[PDB]
Design a protein around this ligand. Structure first.
Ligand SMILES: *[C@@H]1O[C@H](CO)[C@@H](O[C@@H]2O[C@H](CO)[C@@H](O[C@@H]3O[C@H](CO[C@H]4O[C@H](CO[C@H]5O[C@H](CO)[C@@H](O)[C@H](O)[C@@H]5O[C@H]5O[C@H](CO)[C@@H](O)[C@H](O)[C@@H]5O)[C@@H](O)[C@H](O[C@H]5O[C@H](CO)[C@@H](O)[C@H](O)[C@@H]5O)[C@@H]4O)[C@@H](O)[C@H](O[C@H]4O[C@H](CO)[C@@H](O)[C@H](O)[C@@H]4O[C@H]4O[C@H](CO)[C@@H](O)[C@H](O)[C@@H]4O)[C@@H]3O)[C@H](O)[C@H]2NC(C)=O)[C@H](O)[C@H]1NC(C)=O
Ligand SMILES: *[C@@H]1O[C@H](CO)[C@@H](O[C@@H]2O[C@H](CO)[C@@H](O[C@@H]3O[C@H](CO[C@H]4O[C@H](CO[C@H]5O[C@H](CO)[C@@H](O)[C@H](O)[C@@H]5O)[C@@H](O)[C@H](O[C@H]5O[C@H](CO)[C@@H](O)[C@H](O)[C@@H]5O)[C@@H]4O)[C@@H](O)[C@H](O[C@H]4O[C@H](CO)[C@@H](O)[C@H](O)[C@@H]4O[C@H]4O[C@H](CO)[C@@H](O)[C@H](O)[C@@H]4O)[C@@H]3O)[C@H](O)[C@H]2NC(C)=O)[C@H](O)[C@H]1NC(C)=O
Ligand SMILES: *[C@@H]1O[C@H](CO)[C@@H](O[C@@H]2O[C@H](CO)[C@@H](O[C@@H]3O[C@H](CO)[C@@H](O)[C@H](O)[C@@H]3O)[C@H](O)[C@H]2NC(C)=O)[C@H](O)[C@H]1NC(C)=O
Ligand SMILES: *[C@@H]1O[C@H](CO)[C@@H](O[C@@H]2O[C@H](CO)[C@@H](O[C@@H]3O[C@H](CO)[C@@H](O)[C@H](O)[C@@H]3O)[C@H](O)[C@H]2NC(C)=O)[C@H](O)[C@H]1NC(C)=O
Ligand SMILES: *[C@@H]1O[C@H](CO)[C@@H](O[C@@H]2O[C@H](CO)[C@@H](O[C@@H]3O[C@H](CO)[C@@H](O)[C@H](O)[C@@H]3O)[C@H](O)[C@H]2NC(C)=O)[C@H](O)[C@H]1NC(C)=O
Ligand SMILES: *[C@@H]1O[C@H](CO)[C@@H](O[C@@H]2O[C@H](CO)[C@@H](O[C@@H]3O[C@H](CO)[C@@H](O)[C@H](O)[C@@H]3O)[C@H](O)[C@H]2NC(C)=O)[C@H](O)[C@H]1NC(C)=O
Ligand SMILES: *[C@@H]1O[C@H](CO)[C@@H](O[C@@H]2O[C@H](CO)[C@@H](O)[C@H](O)[C@H]2NC(C)=O)[C@H](O)[C@H]1NC(C)=O
Ligand SMILES: *[C@@H]1O[C@H](CO)[C@@H](O[C@@H]2O[C@H](CO)[C@@H](O)[C@H](O)[C@H]2NC(C)=O)[C@H](O)[C@H]1NC(C)=O
Ligand SMILES: *[C@@H]1O[C@H](CO)[C@@H](O[C@@H]2O[C@H](CO)[C@@H](O)[C@H](O)[C@H]2NC(C)=O)[C@H](O)[C@H]1NC(C)=O
Ligand SMILES: *[C@@H]1O[C@H](CO)[C@@H](O[C@@H]2O[C@H](CO)[C@@H](O)[C@H](O)[C@H]2NC(C)=O)[C@H](O)[C@H]1NC(C)=O
Ligand SMILES: *[C@@H]1O[C@H](CO)[C@@H](O[C@@H]2O[C@H](CO)[C@@H](O)[C@H](O)[C@H]2NC(C)=O)[C@H](O)[C@H]1NC(C)=O
Ligand SMILES: *[C@@H]1O[C@H](CO)[C@@H](O[C@@H]2O[C@H](CO)[C@@H](O)[C@H](O)[C@H]2NC(C)=O)[C@H](O)[C@H]1NC(C)=O
Ligand SMILES: *[C@@H]1O[C@H](CO)[C@@H](O[C@@H]2O[C@H](CO)[C@@H](O)[C@H](O)[C@H]2NC(C)=O)[C@H](O)[C@H]1NC(C)=O
Ligand SMILES: *[C@@H]1O[C@H](CO)[C@@H](O)[C@H](O)[C@H]1NC(C)=O
Ligand SMILES: *[C@@H]1O[C@H](CO)[C@@H](O)[C@H](O)[C@H]1NC(C)=O
Ligand SMILES: *[C@@H]1O[C@H](CO)[C@@H](O)[C@H](O)[C@H]1NC(C)=O
Ligand SMILES: *[C@@H]1O[C@H](CO)[C@@H](O)[C@H](O)[C@H]1NC(C)=O
Ligand SMILES: *[C@@H]1O[C@H](CO)[C@@H](O)[C@H](O)[C@H]1NC(C)=O
Ligand SMILES: *[C@@H]1O[C@H](CO)[C@@H](O)[C@H](O)[C@H]1NC(C)=O
Lengths: 121, 98, 445, 129, 129, 129, 48, 85, 48
């Protein structure tokens, strides 16, 4: 299994931060970028950005610069990876559901997805 | 740059018959199917192939800069949203219903 | 008349293939170039008229073999050195405040601990200086930073880290083609091919954000990438005029030596003779700002003619990829390049810049985690001068409306460092047997 | 010229320099742990095995010790049909190899028996008189 | 048939398939630490060494590049005495090899020098006219 | 005599025992880690590589499968000038090799192409009539 | 069968102190000596 | 240890323990030459170190040499035939 | 040296005495500190 476990829902006041996690369990973790997507009520998807898990390097669009932080962490048995997304200055528009996704090749074909986590303000 | 536009906002065909959805997309292309309150799932990548573990009712073909998604022998559960993505860009999908 | 088959042995024909090249060098050091056949004083090169071949980097197999070969030589040189297992103990540290500036406030620690002597039943009390990037507080007493992930190992301070030029030669029955086009892309047909017996002298220097001590282009600045519209691919820039960068470690270091058991020595760090100042690198502000101008002209050709082009500093990650990391004379630097990539170029002084650097001693060279290494201190004062001959960039995604592209420095994967030197070569296999029709027929007797 | 120069020229002019391609098929490392210890040693054994597989073939067809060897198999036009001058004067060994790669296995079977095994027994039953 | 089929047949009918046995003497490991690392490497060197020891012998007797090569040595009946038909039509190479293993070393000496080196010097004495 | 006996004799009498020197160029270790494991394995590979560089040369000059091979190159007296009897009857191969080691590279070039490749194409142009 | 062949009429030049069979006998028994000590007991606790 | 003892090597090296089922007895050894090479042998009785030996001979490998270690006297070796050299 | 007791929590009588609950002192990652841990062992692997 190549599951991508995700954490539960959360809600908070404006002007606060929020962290959402995503586990990787059943494959060679260090060989596939990890992307974060966002879906608003009654809209299409939106690219939040990607992270390279070997070096840990992020890439975000100009809309989210200075507000999003993508990080990762492994354990001293090196089997489990935990990816984190942190959002800093929340507003009403950030009410959405967020998706962990695992790229597979150079077509950007995302075969595995996470359950998704709903968060609102 | 990247251009992308798809063409039935939402059709309303019924059980049995077949329909097609067309995306115009410069540059690779994929198709996804997403039920309400669920994570999407990949059907067709690179515009022509299909992912291992999908009924063969779905199949797509390309010509020029226009791609086609079409499903044969509609089923009571194949009603969901369908959109096409290129790489960061996606589009608001289409809705079909009996 | 009816033509017959005739057989030819030794026709010029070749296909693509993979093999194991062997290496050759000139005339002790980590890359073990004392187990390389000595090179020859005759670099023979043959030009091939009227023939155009097809090159493709990012699939060249000479790169996947240079990688695994210097990862194997690195381990071969650590097998016989000292294991530092007794060094994971509890340390008792204290700030160093003896004639420091104010930038080095908190960068050095003076730690004391209990060590094993040459007798299994005696201990000794010992001190040594450690950098802040190598110790952690146990409960907010310190400990080395690696003692919950890996074991450290370092001796053999008679082995140097200086890179040595290395030629990669091909066995019999194979050949190495070489593209002599001056405006060559990554892939595509090169119409001015030529053959050699082995490549030029390649230096295995490792670095992260800038490419150092490499080769230059002859016509202008080149920009190579596979699918420049895919923002998950790095970009390789190559200058045509070098930029100098002078780096130094201005402290006067001393080196103790502690007999930990029989025949084992640990090389600590003694006191410092003088003042404690920070390490840095100075770059000429005029030359740098000029070559950055010559890069945006070529960068504009791939995007619209009136686009805004920005440079920003790295956005995050590990310490190795968020800074310019290199090795100068046995010490490992990590310099803050946030003063080089800070500008905005739209269409239509005479001093230097100073980049502050840090230093580490516990090194985890390739992303492998289960085995770190220590690095003994160097006596005296460090100083080196290098050429900057390229960059590794990364474009910000999600850019619509066709304006304001943003680039940031990247790196991390050493294979991109080898592709900047082996983009001209490819390996082919000779097929010397061919048949053809002709009029002669064998004489029956 | 030198190694692989005639690769530019046409078949007629390139088939006068076979010895230079033939001489560089054996060595060139004249005088000279696993890394760089068994790396090389694995190469030198493959160079010999690839060289002996071709001397064996040339011997089976009756061409041992030669570089040009007129055989006794007729050229079926189904393999190709081009005027002789349109082959030896306006194309190269690189071009012609791609136009013929589909039939060499067919031809190689003929050379092996359609001449030599057929002829090796006839001289046997002829020298008995 | 295939590799070693004619092992069943008689010498006359089995001497039509020499190329089949001859082709399978070189390789078979066509494509890609000691165990399974130096196991192979010790085998591929023995195959080349055993293959060159017989090409050398054939060249010394004057039979280089051939599969059937009749010589200038007469057959002493003290080695065997059987009608020619009682050899080429009602027995096999396996049967015949066991009847001769005592004399091959005697024969090999006659082929080596007592026939060829005696003949290699006479073309010298003839070609100098 | 035996291996290398004729080393004492004159060229005329020493050129009757070539097979003795030729047979001992391949093996002699008839039946048989790094020490004594990887050195010997590098000995057996060098012996094969050295034995094939010589058979390749003999084939290029048109001498494959022979021990004495009359060529078609005239003897330039600038290499040496001694009466024929003063060579084949009163000196040895050891003496003569030192008196000639300066010109072998000159001679080897004449044999390779300037005689055989010149001759190999003429038969090609002749057999097409 | 220790074969040995006599070579009449030939004189050769010998020179010890440059013989290479000596520099190979040396390094080959220095190396067999360590090969026999690798697999046996380390006496680390004896330094007390 | 100070003017209590210690082993003499504890400040320069570590000790291994001369594995007890392996003998130190020297055994004759013949050094043979690969193919394509030969071993010459001088049979002069009064042979110097260097110089021309006029009674050469060839062998496939040497006589049995015992690898005996010693310092001031050479032991269990070979003798001269005519006189002291 | 281990310190073991019997496992009697919800067993049949096939397993009376087949499992032991042992506790001991182990070395941690810092050379001067130990930890006290426990583990279950089969009776065929320990001796009194
Ligand atoms: C990209 O490529 C770049 C180009 O290759 C590369 O840069 C090069 O990097 C290497 C590696 O870091 C550099 O090589 C090192 O250079 C060190 C400096 O050597 C120079 O300075 C020495 C000191 O000179 C002072 O003292 C002399 C008396 O000895 C005086 O004569 C001098 O005038 C000078 O006096 C000044 O200082 C006095 C003391 O303070 C003062 O009294 C006085 O008034 C005045 O102010 C010189 O000795 C030395 O000379 C060497 O080189 C010249 C040629 O320039 C030769 O002619 C000489 O024969 C001699 O070889 C230089 O001028 C070296 O010290 C250093 O060597 C040490 O390390 C190596 C390797 O480990 C050892 O083999 C070597 O022996 C040294 O180790 C030893 O050090 C200690 C103390 O000596 C010793 O006890 C110990 O046992 C140990 O063995 C090394 O070679 C090179 O310089 C860089 N090039 C440049 C142009 O900068 C760059 O790194 C590359 N980038 C990347 C990323 O890879
Ligand atoms: C980065 O990655 C991206 C992917 O994300 C890469 O994009 C790829 O870019 C290449 C080259 O830029 C594209 O190849 C080109 O594809 C087009 C379109 O192909 C479709 O249409 C073909 C028919 O098109 C004609 O007819 C239609 C109407 O019928 C018209 O609208 C068109 O304008 C044309 O007139 C059709 O034949 C194709 O199917 C065939 O090909 C595919 C494989 O592509 C097969 O699977 C099919 O089975 C079938 O065989 C397809 O449906 C082609 O039209 C282009 O043809 C050019 O190149 C030919 C050589 O192969 C050449 O013979 C043609 O004459 C033509 O020449 C071009 O250049 C001339 C220069 O003077 C022009 O004058 C001329 O007008 C023409 O433009 C070409 O094959 C890829 O499709 C594209 N992939 C994707 C997914 O977008 C990008 O390359 C990467 N970059 C780097 C640096 O790596
Ligand atoms: C870094 O620190 C070391 C250690 O102090 C410095 O080395 C020292 O350099 C001085 C001056 O070159 C030496 O002084 C000399 O002393 C001798 C007598 O010993 C005297 O005859 C000379 O005239 C001179 O005064 C000193 O010996 C030397 N120390 C050692 C241990 O060698 C070094 O110079 C410092 N480096 C820098 C860049 O400051
Ligand atoms: C890499 O270098 C850059 C600049 O070269 C570093 O950014 C600089 O960080 C310092 C320390 O936090 C900032 O100084 C602060 O300035 C404010 C305003 O005067 C003052 O109130 C503070 O007390 C402090 O002095 C400095 O402003 C900032 N520069 C910029 C342009 O933001 C950066 O931190 C370095 N990277 C790392 C990892 O340290
Ligand atoms: C990255 O680039 C920006 C823009 O070039 C740099 O900010 C600029 O820094 C200079 C030097 O301090 C400022 O000049 C001086 O500023 C003070 C107060 O800001 C002013 O009173 C002086 O008269 C003088 O103009 C300049 O104002 C400032 N620009 C802005 C918009 O803040 C920045 O320092 C660069 N970062 C690095 C790490 O180099
Ligand atoms: C590369 O291709 C070019 C283009 O074909 C070759 O140049 C041509 O080579 C031919 C063959 O030597 C020349 O023909 C000559 O014609 C004159 C006049 O009839 C005749 O007297 C000569 O004996 C010879 O036959 C031709 O002039 C020359 N140039 C052209 C066609 O423009 C070139 O040789 C090729 N190089 C290689 C290395 O293959
Ligand atoms: C090994 O122990 C260290 C000691 O804390 C762990 O350090 C982490 O360090 C990073 C940055 O220094 C902090 O952000 C983390 O919070 C620290 N960990 C914890 C649990 O607080 C380090 O993670 C340990 N290594 C492993 C593989 O667990
Ligand atoms: C995708 O499918 C549609 C039909 O569902 C195709 O549109 C038809 O194209 C043909 C030409 O081949 C025309 O004759 C029809 O009139 C079109 N139908 C309509 C309703 O306009 C379309 O061509 C397909 N896409 C591709 C790239 O072939
Ligand atoms: C080195 O080991 C000695 C052990 O003798 C440590 O001294 C002990 O420190 C603990 C710490 O609380 C005290 O409780 C003991 O009473 C001390 N023992 C003696 C004999 O004084 C010493 O702390 C160690 N050194 C370091 C740097 O940790
Ligand atoms: C690091 O701390 C040690 C103490 O453990 C310092 O060593 C002492 O230095 C003073 C200086 O006057 C001497 O009087 C003491 O005798 C030293 N003690 C020992 C045990 O050597 C050392 O100087 C400090 N180093 C730095 C750079 O601050
Ligand atoms: C196996 O042996 C049998 C008989 O011993 C062979 O059958 C005969 O073969 C001869 C020629 O060798 C034919 O002329 C006969 O017609 C065959 N049939 C009989 C005698 O009944 C058979 O060919 C042998 N098989 C092989 C593979 O050699
Ligand atoms: C060694 O040399 C001697 C003389 O140099 C040779 O003895 C003569 O050999 C010739 C050649 O057959 C005979 O005709 C003479 O009768 C021999 N005796 C003389 C001249 O006194 C001897 O044959 C040489 N031996 C070898 C093995 O070459
Ligand atoms: C683990 O080690 C501790 C040492 O601290 C042991 O506790 C000691 O046990 C001895 C019995 O021989 C007592 O005399 C000491 O008083 C004990 N010390 C303390 C501090 O309690 C403990 O028994 C060991 N654990 C196991 C399972 O053997
Ligand atoms: C060292 O100094 C820093 C501030 O400069 C302080 O926070 C820290 O507690 C000090 N540590 C010690 C061991 O003195
Ligand atoms: C290099 O590649 C780019 C993009 O594929 C193309 O625009 C350019 O023409 C190429 N250069 C050459 C010399 O073909
Ligand atoms: C030539 O080949 C064709 C098939 O490609 C075959 O039908 C024909 O019989 C062959 N001709 C001869 C003479 O073998
Ligand atoms: C045949 O062999 C016998 C047995 O050795 C021998 O007596 C006889 O002379 C040989 N005949 C010939 C012609 O050599
Ligand atoms: C013989 O060699 C000499 C020396 O180079 C040369 O001058 C002469 O032309 C040569 N003669 C022949 C016929 O080769
Ligand atoms: C042997 O050597 C000695 C001194 O080295 C010398 O006097 C004597 O002449 C030599 N003998 C011969 C036969 O060369």
């Amino acid at each position: 299994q190549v599951q991508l476990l995700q954490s539960g829902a959360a809600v908070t006041k404006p002007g606060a931060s929020v962290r959402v996690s995503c586990e990787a369990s059943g494959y060679n973790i260090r060989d596939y970028f990890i992307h974060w997507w966002r879906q608003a009520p009654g809209q299409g998807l939106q690219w939040v950005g990607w992270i390279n898990p070997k070096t840990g390097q992020p890439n975000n669009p100009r809309q989210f610069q200075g507000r999003v932080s993508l990080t990762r962490h492994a354990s001293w048995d090196f089997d489990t990876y935990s990816f984190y997304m942190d959002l800093k200055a929340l507003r009403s528009d950030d009410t959405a559901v967020y998706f962990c996704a695992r790229q597979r090749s150079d077509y950007w074909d995302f075969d595995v997805w996470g359950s998704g986590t709903q968060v609102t303000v | 740059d990247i251009q992308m536009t798809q063409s039935p906002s939402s059709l309303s065909a019924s059980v049995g018959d077949t329909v097609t959805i067309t995306c115009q997309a410069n540059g690779y292309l994929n198709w996804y199917q997403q039920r309400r309150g669920k994570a999407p799932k990949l059907l067709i990548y690179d515009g022509s192939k299909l992912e291992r573990g999908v009924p063969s009712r779905f199949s797509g073909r390309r010509w020029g800069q226009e791609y086609n998604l079409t499903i044969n022998n509609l089923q009571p559960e194949d009603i969901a949203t369908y959109f096409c993505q290129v790489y960061e860009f996606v589009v608001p999908g289409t809705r079909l219903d009996l | 008349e009816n033509l017959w088959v005739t057989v030819y042995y030794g026709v010029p024909v070749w296909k693509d293939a993979e093999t194991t090249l062997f290496c050759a060098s000139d005339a002790h050091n980590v890359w073990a170039t004392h187990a390389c056949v000595p090179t020859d004083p005759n670099p023979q090169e043959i030009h091939l008229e009227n023939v155009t071949e097809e090159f493709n980097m990012w699939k060249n197999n000479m790169v996947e073999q240079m990688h695994t070969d210097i990862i194997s030589l690195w381990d071969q040189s650590l097998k016989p050195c000292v294991k530092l297992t007794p060094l994971c103990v509890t340390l008792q540290c204290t700030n160093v405040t003896n004639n420091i500036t104010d930038d080095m406030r908190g960068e050095l620690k003076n730690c004391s601990f209990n060590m094993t002597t040459e007798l299994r039943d005696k201990k000794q009390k010992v001190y040594s200086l450690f950098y802040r990037l190598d110790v952690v507080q146990i409960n907010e007493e310190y400990r080395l930073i690696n003692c919950n992930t890996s074991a450290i190992t370092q001796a053999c301070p008679k082995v140097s880290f200086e890179p040595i030029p290395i030629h990669y030669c091909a066995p019999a029955g194979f050949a190495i083609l070489k593209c002599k086009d001056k405006k060559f892309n990554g892939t595509g047909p090169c119409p001015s091919v030529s053959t050699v017996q082995c490549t030029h002298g390649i230096k295995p220097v490792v670095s992260t954000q800038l490419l150092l001590n490499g080769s230059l282009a002859e016509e202008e600045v080149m920009i190579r990438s596979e699918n420049i519209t895919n923002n998950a691919k790095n970009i390789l820039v190559q200058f045509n005029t070098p930029v100098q960068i002078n780096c130094t470690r201005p402290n006067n270091n001393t080196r103790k030596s502690i007999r930990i058991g029989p025949g084992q020595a640990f090389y600590a760090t003694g006191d410092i003779i003088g003042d404690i100042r920070q390490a840095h690198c100075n770059v000429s502000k005029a030359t740098w700002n000029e070559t950055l101008g010559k890069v945006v002209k070529q960068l504009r050709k791939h995007f619209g003619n009136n686009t805004i082009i920005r440079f920003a500093n790295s956005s995050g990650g590990d310490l190795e990829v968020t800074t310019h990391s290199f090795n100068c004379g046995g010490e490992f630097f990590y310099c803050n390049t946030s003063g080089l990539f800070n500008s905005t170029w739209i269409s239509n002084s005479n001093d230097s810049i100073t980049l502050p650097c840090r230093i580490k001693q516990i090194i985890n060279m390739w992303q492998r985690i289960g085995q770190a290494m220590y690095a003994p201190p160097i006596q005296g004062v460090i100083r080196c001068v290098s050429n900057i001959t390229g960059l590794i960039l990364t474009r910000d995604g999600g850019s619509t409306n066709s304006t304001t592209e943003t680039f940031r420095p990247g790196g991390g994967d050493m294979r991109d460092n080898w592709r900047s030197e082996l983009y001209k070569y490819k390996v082919v296999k000779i097929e010397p047997l061919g048949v053809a029709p002709t009029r002669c027929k064998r004489r029956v007797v | 010229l030198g190694f692989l120069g005639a690769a530019g020229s046409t078949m007629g002019a390139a088939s006068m320099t076979l010895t230079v391609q033939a001489r560089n098929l054996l060595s060139g490392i004249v005088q000279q742990l696993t890394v760089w210890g068994i790396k090389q040693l694995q190469a030198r054994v493959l160079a010999v095995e690839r060289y002996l597989r071709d001397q064996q073939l040339l011997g089976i067809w009756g061409c041992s010790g030669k570089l040009i060897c007129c055989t006794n198999v007729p050229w079926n036009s189904s393999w190709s049909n081009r005027n002789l001058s349109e082959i030896w004067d306006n194309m190269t060994w690189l071009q012609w190899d791609k136009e013929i790669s589909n039939y060499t296995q067919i031809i190689y079977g003929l050379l092996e028996e359609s001449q030599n095994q057929q002829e090796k027994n006839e001289q046997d039953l002829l020298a008995l008189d």
